[PDB]
Paper text:
The final structure, with a resolution of 2.7-Å, was refined to Rwork = 0.243 and Rfree = 0.273, respectively. Within the crystallographic asymmetric unit of the structure, a single A16 protein and one G9 protein are present in a 1:1 binding mode. Traceable electron densities can be observed for A16 residues L7-C291 and G9 amino acids E8-N268. Both A16 and G9 feature with an extended rod-like fold. Sterically, the NTD and CTD of A16 are linked via a relatively long loop, which might be of certain flexibility. Unlike that of A16, however, the inter-domain linker in G9 is of short length and an inter-domain disulfide-bond (C89/C127) is observed to form, dragging the two domains into close proximity. Resultantly, the two protein subunits are aligned almost in parallel, leading to good complementarity and the formation of an extended binding interface. In order to characterize the atomic binding details between the two proteins, we further subdivided the binding interface into five patches (Patch1-Patch5) based on the G9 components involved in A16-engagement. Within these three patches, a large number of interface residues are identified for inter-molecule contacts, including G9-residues F92-N93 and T95-H96, and A16-residues D170, T173, R177, K194-P195, S198, D202 and F227 in Patch3, G9-residues D120-H122, R142-N143, H146-Q147, G150-S151, N154, H191-H192, A195 and N197, and A16-residues E166, R193-K194, S198, S201, D223-F227, D229-T230, Y233-V234, Y282-N283 and R290 in Patch4 and G9-residues C243, C248-A251, V253, Y261, L264-G265 and C267-N268, and A16-residues D257-K258, L260-R263, C265-W266, Q287 and C291 in Patch5. It is noteworthy that the amino acids involved in vaccinia virus A16/G9 binding are highly conserved among members of the Orthopoxvirus genus, demonstrating that the orthopoxviruses, including the monkeypox virus, would share quite similar binding patterns and likely the same interaction details for A16/G9 sub-complex formation.
Poxviruses are a group of enveloped viruses, the entry of which require the fusion between viral envelop and cell membrane. In poxviruses, however, its fusion process is mediated by a large proteinaceous machinery, which is designated as the entry-fusion complex (EFC). It is believed that poxvirus EFC is composed of at least eleven virus-encoded protein subunits, among which the A16 and G9 subunits (nomenclatures of A16, G9 and other proteins refer to vaccinia virus, a prototype membrane of Orthopoxvirus genus in Poxviridae family) form a sub-complex and play a key role in EFC assembly and function. In this study, we reported the crystal structure of the A16/G9 sub-complex from the vaccinia virus.
Numbering used by the authors:
A (entry chain B): 8 to 268
B (entry chain A): 7 to 291
Amino acid sequence: ELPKRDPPPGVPTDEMLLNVDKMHDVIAPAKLLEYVHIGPLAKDKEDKVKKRYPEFRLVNTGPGGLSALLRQSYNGTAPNCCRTFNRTHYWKKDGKISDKYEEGAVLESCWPDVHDTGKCDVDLFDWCQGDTFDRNICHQWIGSAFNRSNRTVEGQQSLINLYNKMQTLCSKDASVPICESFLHHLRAHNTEDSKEMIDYILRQQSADFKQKYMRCSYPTRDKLEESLKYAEPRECWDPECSNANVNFLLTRNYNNLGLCN
Amino acid sequence: LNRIKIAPGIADIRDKYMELGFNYPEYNRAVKFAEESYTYYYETSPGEIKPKFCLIDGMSIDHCSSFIVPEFAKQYVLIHGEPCSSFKFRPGSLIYYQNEVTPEYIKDLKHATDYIASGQRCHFIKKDYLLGDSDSVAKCCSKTNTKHCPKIFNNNYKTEHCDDFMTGFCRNDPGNPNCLEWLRAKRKPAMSTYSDICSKHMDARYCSEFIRIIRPDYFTFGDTALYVFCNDHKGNRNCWCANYPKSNSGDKYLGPRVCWLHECTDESRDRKWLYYNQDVQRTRC
């Protein structure tokens, strides 16, 4: 009786074949408001996926369980994000953090280009200023803080604020290896303002610092009056300057050392 | 329940008319319906493609997809669509509601018949390639296979999506030219990655290139590597401008003082074995 037609045979698409179980490398690098399509997802799976990817909203895009994850936030922490340039995310399980994905783990994602934003500045200021100093990390941090000069208003204020904070700190004791790196990078900046800041910082140093560290810049008069005799700068011969640590020379002295043969 | 007949359409071959008589004659009808829009290698509307087919509740999703050439299909996602009704016995038929044919009628028929099902019309929308697997990521980012890749993972590393994969890839093949195009974007995980590599293998030519990029702007990432490498390799000749072995002094020829040694005076042009503060002054002399 009825003129029956069976539907034309179904031919799926990639979307339809997608499986979120396989997609951690696809989903982690996604950005805010970018809809990451994940295939049909059954209702009894929604909680697992919401657990795993808590920074994302779970959305139903279409029929038959078709779905997507939409990133909402970066909830990775300064302790785990700021003390490294290595990693943009980590997977968390049982109080432990692992670089590699493990099932049962929850993904946390670091804020992008975070160091250029200055949101790590309060963490590293503490961390690097102690026995918690990691030379490589802590140097890198100051280097790149300077590079925020040509970037963003946020990063330029960052730069400014940190610079103010570091002036006041390093005036107290420029020996602390964090302040050594600061001065090192001012020298690298190599403008009038970076030079006179060094001299400013250096000129506020303590009684012991100057005799322990700046003998080249503060010679004894016996030493000083020999220098007058020669048209070679004092630095080109003075044994106190061949030894000395260049990060604690004043600009004049630092300049002068380059002029010898 | 009698004289079922399929009347041809006037215009759309896909469109048809289903005529029918009934035991109750007040239910008599001439229903317009369409089916099987041809397989599409193109779009119905701006960014849209809507097959002339009603997806009854419970019908397999792929049935919408059967009317799109599979290559052209990879880009498109299937979202929800407006309520439609279909003939159970001929499921996937799109009923058009025109004149005598009216939602009341259809609501009513269902009440009295199992010859009516309902669903949503197939609505496809254009986005980009989906990429649901790790290998799919590796192929796109490394550029060993590029063909079915979205822009986010195939823009010569402009955006950052590939940094996770390239972090591990390039650790293994630092010399890879793509690892170098990646590093040339100067985002912090690349630079950081190469500071680790070159701290171990500074003597490679890729470390030369590493240094060549990061300077002038991100020089610290090279200085860090030089320091550790030369700390870990005191026997290497090329290290002695940066860590000169007099026990009291390895800082001896840093900064201004670099011009003092004849060796460190340009002999070879090899920036990498002198720190930034150092090789600035070399030229200054």
